[PDB]
Copies of this chain bind each other. A is one copy, B any other.
Amino acid sequence: VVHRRDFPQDFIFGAGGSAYQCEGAYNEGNRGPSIWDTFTQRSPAKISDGSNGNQAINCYHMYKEDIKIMKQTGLESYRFSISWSRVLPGGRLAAGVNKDGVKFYHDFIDELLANGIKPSVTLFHWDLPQALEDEYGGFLSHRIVDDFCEYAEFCFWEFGDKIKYWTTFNEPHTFAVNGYALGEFAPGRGGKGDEGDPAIEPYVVTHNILLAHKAAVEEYRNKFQKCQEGEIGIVLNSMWMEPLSDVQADIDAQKRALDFMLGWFLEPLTTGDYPKSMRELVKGRLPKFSADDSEKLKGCYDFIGMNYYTATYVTNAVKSNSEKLSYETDDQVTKTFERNQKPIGHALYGGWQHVVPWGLYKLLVYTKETYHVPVLYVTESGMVEENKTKILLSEARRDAERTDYHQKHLASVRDAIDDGVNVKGYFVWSFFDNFEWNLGYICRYGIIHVDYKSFERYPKESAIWYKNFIAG
């Protein structure tokens, strides 16, 4: 029960992918290694099944086909990302610009347009050129901000004549928390036995991300927006934080959990400063913005993309022995999916995603309430699914649960727009089944089935549902 009609005339329906997870051909067409190759190649034991995005799902060879599948599905827009290191193999500009790479993107762009599909480019989705990570520590250094400027500029210039929707960072919260705190994702530092420092690094990284985002955005506003007629934003994520009980401790915990995952970023792009909740708890470990930075950061995005998966009960926690100072612990908030052994929502394959359609509602509404953002897009939305091998294609593709999941989720999204909040886009994650980072290929997210061996692609029932729904 929910149709195209209940959504604005101009609302955009879409799905996504991302270089590393899709393109494959890591070592073809002159592409320079990203930290994600290196992670997955030097540290394969940190991948659930030991795999890597070397071939991924081979979107780099098969684009013409994929865009076929897109149009069959009726996507209004697809969201993909440029592998930084495929346009600039060595990271900076001295290393040179790789012509094979820029052909691909152009070919790809032109193909989407040739099929009536709106291109939407994330600049950075964690596939940071190894070259840079290596030289100066990547985002551990303010050197990155400047190189990201060049990268951003090059792209806008090279391709921007034809894409009107730019994204700087995809889920920088994740990138830095999983990267420099959990040690679970490229470059894999901070976690135990790992090389970093989980008390310091995350905060440095995100500090620089915001500083890069800022330079990226300014570049575009001042030198390109006037002509290309486009919009840059940044897409962030959060779980919804539901107070476990109606006590103050929980109520406040929600604020800290929210601030520390979302505010961490939004607040700067709002006030010019980090959540006080964080300043309060993180103290000297949380870097300061120059007086100018603060101002230039205020309202410095054209839109916020928003990725939602799940919601957790939240509560203030007490430990304090074998606490190591770490970002993990700093938001003194214990999460749990259980109220009174009752889960918050049905528990999907991972053990982490729980279907909570209504968390998306609460979160969006929250983001208006607290961050008064002009333009909002649900940029990632979707359900995980175990990759059962030993079942026929005939079966795997009857993903009713996934149809349902997007129905319910769209229902909340409608309910958010209806109550004021200015959502303008739903983006199914993921268009195709792809490489699920540290989980490799043990699961699937897409509305188009992909055989991780043959690369063959068959549409799930969800895709079909969606084809009909996009067409009201």
B42 touches A94 (CB 8 A): yes
Contact A226/B389 with A27-B98, A135-B134, A157-B459 known, Cβ cut-off 8 Å = no
Q: Which residue of B lies closest to A465 (CB)?
A: B223
- Interface size (A, Cβ < 8 Å)? 55
Within 8 A of B (CB), among A211-256: 223, 226-227
B49 touches A389 (CB 8 A): yes
A374 interface contact, C-beta 8 A? no
Residues of B within 8 A of A28 (CB): 30
List 13 A-B pairs, Cβ < 8 Å: A28-B30, A32-B33, A33-B131, A50-B390, A50-B391, A51-B453, A94-B392, A97-B456, A130-B131, A134-B135, A223-B468, A226-B471, A453-B453
Give the distance in Å from the alpha carbon of A92 to the alpha carbon of B393 in the complex: 10
Count of identical protomers in the assembly? 3
Within 8 A of B (CB), among A1-53: 27-28, 30, 32-33, 37-38, 41-42, 44-45, 47, 49-51
A94 to chain B, nearest CB (A): 4
B51 touches A227 (CB 8 A): no
A55 interface contact, C-beta 8 A? yes
Give the distance in Å from the alpha carbon of A226 to the alpha carbon of B393 in the complex: 26
Give the distance in Å from the alpha carbon of A49 to the alpha carbon of B387 in the complex: 12
Contact A453/B33 with A98-B27, A464-B223 known, Cβ cut-off 8 Å = no
Residues of B within 8 A of A90 (CB): 33, 37-38, 41
Give the distance in Å from the alpha carbon of A28 to the alpha carbon of B158 in the complex: 21
Q: Which residue of B38, B94, B227, B467 contacts A41 across the interface (Cβ within 8 Å)?
A: B94
B30 touches A74 (CB 8 A): no
A340 to chain B, nearest CB (A): 39
Give the distance in Å from the alpha carbon of A97 to the alpha carbon of B54 in the complex: 13
Q: Which residue of B33, B161, B454 contacts A54 across the interface (Cβ within 8 Å)?
A: B454
Interface string of A83-118 (1 = CB under 8 A from B): 000000110111111100000000000000000000
A458 interface contact, C-beta 8 A? yes
Give the distance in Å from the alpha carbon of A161 to the alpha carbon of B470 in the complex: 14
Q: Which residue of B50, B389, B471 contacts A389 across the interface (Cβ within 8 Å)?
A: B50
A27 touches B456 (CB 8 A): no
A194 interface contact, C-beta 8 A? no
A321 interface contact, C-beta 8 A? no
Give the distance in Å from the alpha carbon of A190 to the alpha carbon of B108 in the complex: 47
A72 interface contact, C-beta 8 A? yes
Interface string of A386-402 (1 = CB under 8 A from B): 00011111100000000
Within 8 A of B (CB), among A416-470: 453-454, 456, 458-459, 464, 467-468
Residues of B within 8 A of A66 (CB): none
Contact A72/B150 with A223-B464, A226-B468 known, Cβ cut-off 8 Å = no
Residues of B within 8 A of A391 (CB): 44-45, 50
Q: Which residue of B lies closest to A470 (CB)?
A: B227
Known A93-B393, A223-B464; further 20 A-B contacts with Cβ < 8 A: A28-B30, A30-B30, A32-B33, A42-B392, A44-B390, A47-B390, A50-B390, A50-B391, A51-B389, A54-B454, A55-B453, A71-B161, A72-B157, A93-B392, A94-B392, A131-B134, A134-B134, A227-B467, A227-B468, A453-B453
Q: Which residue of B lies closest to A227 (CB)?
A: B471
Most buried by B among A131, A158, A393: A393
A392 to chain B, nearest CB (A): 6
A470 to chain B, nearest CB (A): 8
B394 touches A94 (CB 8 A): yes
Contact A458/B389 with A130-B131, A131-B33, A471-B227 known, Cβ cut-off 8 Å = no
Q: Which residue of B lies closest to A27 (CB)?
A: B96
Give the distance in Å from the alpha carbon of A45 to the alpha carbon of B38 in the complex: 31
Contact A44/B227 with A30-B30, A72-B157, A72-B161 known, Cβ cut-off 8 Å = no
Contact A96/B456 with A223-B468, A226-B468 known, Cβ cut-off 8 Å = yes
A154 to chain B, nearest CB (A): 8
Give the distance in Å from the alpha carbon of A219 to the alpha carbon of B420 in the complex: 38
B130 touches A45 (CB 8 A): no
Residues of B within 8 A of A464 (CB): 157, 223
